Structure 1
Amino acid sequence: SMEQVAMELRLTELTRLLRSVLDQLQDKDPARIFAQPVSLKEVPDYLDHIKHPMDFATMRKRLEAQGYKNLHEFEEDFDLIIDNCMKYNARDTVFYRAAVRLRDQGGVVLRQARREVDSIG
């Protein structure tokens, strides 16, 4: 149907906007601490601690499959990256501190993404 095509075009455009958001958020992790999944070879007990692991590569795979239907779903995954880190790692670690900085700098990006999503529909 033409309605299905139109819905598919809207999803494609949301995916384009989320890719730009993803790139801007990942720039705020210059150490690449959140770039890839926590390795279960290196941290064999990780899934005893963290029930829903997340990282930027995993988000990018989902994005490129058009697997984010709305900005809320994308933000949920970004918040997992931060929140997982802040539980597993202690306050006095480079990892925790990196997540705080990513949260703080990312909030700005996400605040405008929300206005753009609503504005463009």
Structure 2
Amino acid sequence: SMNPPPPETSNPNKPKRQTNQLQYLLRVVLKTLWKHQFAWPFQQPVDAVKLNLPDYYKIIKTPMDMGTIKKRLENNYYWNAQECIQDFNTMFTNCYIYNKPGDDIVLMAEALEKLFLQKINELPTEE
């Protein structure tokens, strides 16, 4: 059961912007989660072949990970902050959909999500 191609991170025809909110999502939100001790399972797309999870991409149909988010922010791929915030939320929700309460991977996502929520609570107003 192969891995699908990763989510898109480059598209020259996509309208995109650099807003102060998107700068905050890279410089504060992404950077804080990325350096966390629990970040590594989320730093790249799930390799469901190497992890022996043949059902993963049959259940998770909108995959997302912080490696993809990092590339999108570095490429200024987004139009607005909500688009990027949705990518984070997709990543967390996907984790809770696929896994069981109290699993190690869920505990790791919950720690990252708590920090995520604390940082987006202080999202600056758009200038």
> Normalising by structure 1, what TM-score?
0.78
Looking at structure 2, the residues matched to 100 and 40 of structure 1 have their Cα atoms a distance apart, in angstroms, of 21
User: Aligned-pair distance for 1:15?
Assistant: 4.5
Match of 2:101 in 1: 91
| Structure 1 unaligned spans of 5+ | 1-7
From the CA coordinates, give the structure whose radius of gyration is larger: 1
Percent of aligned positions that are identical: 31
- The equivalent of 2:64 in structure 1 is 54
The answer as to 2:30 corresponding to 1:22 is yes
User: What's the secondary structure of 2:48's corresponding residue?
Assistant: coil
Partner of 1:3: none
- Give the whole-Å Cα distance in 1 for the aligned partners of 2:20 and 2:86: 20
Could you say which structure has the higher helix fraction?
1
Aligned-pair Cα RMSD in Å: 2.0
Q: Cα offset for 1:16? A: 3.1
Matched AA of 1:35: Q
Q: Distance in 2 between matches of 1:16 and 1:96?
A: 28
Q: Work out the CA distance in 2 between the residues paired with 1:97 and 1:46.
A: 19
Give SS of 1:37's match. Answer: coil
Q: Which residue of 2 aligns with 1:4?
A: none
Asked if the contact 1:82–1:103 (Cα under 8 Å) also holds between the matched residues in 2, the reply is yes
TM-score (ref. length: structure 2): 0.74
Opposite residue 44 of structure 2, the aligned amino acid is: Q
For 2:109 and 2:19, how far apart are their aligned partners in 1?
Answer: 29
Structure 2, gaps ≥5 residues long: 1-15
Aligned residues: 108
Q: Which has the higher contact order (CA 8 A, sep 6+)?
A: 2
Q: Separation in 2 of the partners of 1:105 and 1:61?
A: 20
